[PDB]
């Protein structure tokens, strides 16, 4: 894949202040810091699922957020689960920086071994300064409590330990986090539970419920998140 490769370097030349010298120095450097390949977390059966989730999120963090502007693992959201799981395995083998969508697939791959853990995508549409912004994380449920795995440029727009007692509190935490960086939350897309079968021929349902956060209002927004939580226990 040489075409893509030189595409990434030309795009860096534009956006960075000293675009050209940066590519020269890095591509031409004979000695670079060797990056250790992150070890895939494997768990004893005695380890509680919350402690497992911290290790999965730590592994996801080690890969780092992809700031290069070029995505290394393209994801067709309509692919069957067994196709995305093959792709997650290759992220595991390539071990490259990632963005929001790739971390959701990794979170599913690494939590398929936890049948007591429910996983479901949560994507957000936010508004700021005339522009729209889309982000997505992996919602998780353990022992009746809610949390999230994901990848973001902000610390409070990804990992939440499974401590929220309702889905509303989890989502409103994200809305509050969006508000702290002056983003208005326009729309929330919540998916259905993801099968734990890594060979499953079914798609992820990214849009089982679409909530218009402005046209709904506070309490009607809360009732909709509670209906979605009720729906995942189907």
């Amino acid at each position: 894949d040489e075409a893509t490769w030189e595409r990434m370097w030309k795009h860096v030349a534009k956006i960075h202040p000293d675009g050209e010298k940066v590519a020269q120095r890095i591509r031409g450097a004979t000695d670079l810091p060797k990056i250790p390949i992150p070890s895939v977390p494997t768990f004893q059966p005695s380890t509680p699922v919350p402690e497992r989730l911290e290790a999965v999120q730590r592994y996801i963090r080690e890969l780092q957020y992809n700031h290069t502007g070029t995505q290394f693992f393209e994801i067709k959201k309509s692919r069957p689960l067994t196709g995305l799981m093959d792709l997650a395995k290759e992220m595991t083998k390539e071990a490259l920086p990632i963005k929001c969508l790739e971390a959701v697939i990794l979170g599913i791959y690494l939590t398929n071994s936890m049948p007591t853990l429910e996983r479901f995508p949560i994507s957000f549409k936010t508004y700021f300064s005339g522009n729209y912004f889309r982000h997505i994380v992996l919602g998780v449920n353990f022992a009746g409590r809610y949390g999230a795995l994901g990848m973001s440029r902000r610390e409070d727009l990804m990992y939440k330990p499974p401590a929220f007692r309702t889905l509303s509190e989890l989502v409103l935490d994200f809305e509050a986090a969006y508000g702290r960086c002056w983003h208005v939350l326009k729309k929330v897309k919540l998916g259905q539970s993801v099968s734990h079968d890594p060979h499953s021929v079914e798609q992820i349902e990214w849009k089982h419920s679409v909530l218009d956060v402005e046209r709904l209002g506070r309490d009607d927004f809360r009732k909709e998140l509670e209906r979605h939580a009720r729906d995942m226990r189907l």
Partner: peptide, 24 residues
């Protein structure tokens, strides 16, 4: 293995670039 020695150097370069791009 010519494929494999190429992915390791590319990975070192991607993370070198990724570090610079985190200046924001």
């Amino acid at each position: 293995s010519a494929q494999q020695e190429l992915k390791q150097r590319q990975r070192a370069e991607i993370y070198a670039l990724n570090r610079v791009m985190t200046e924001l």
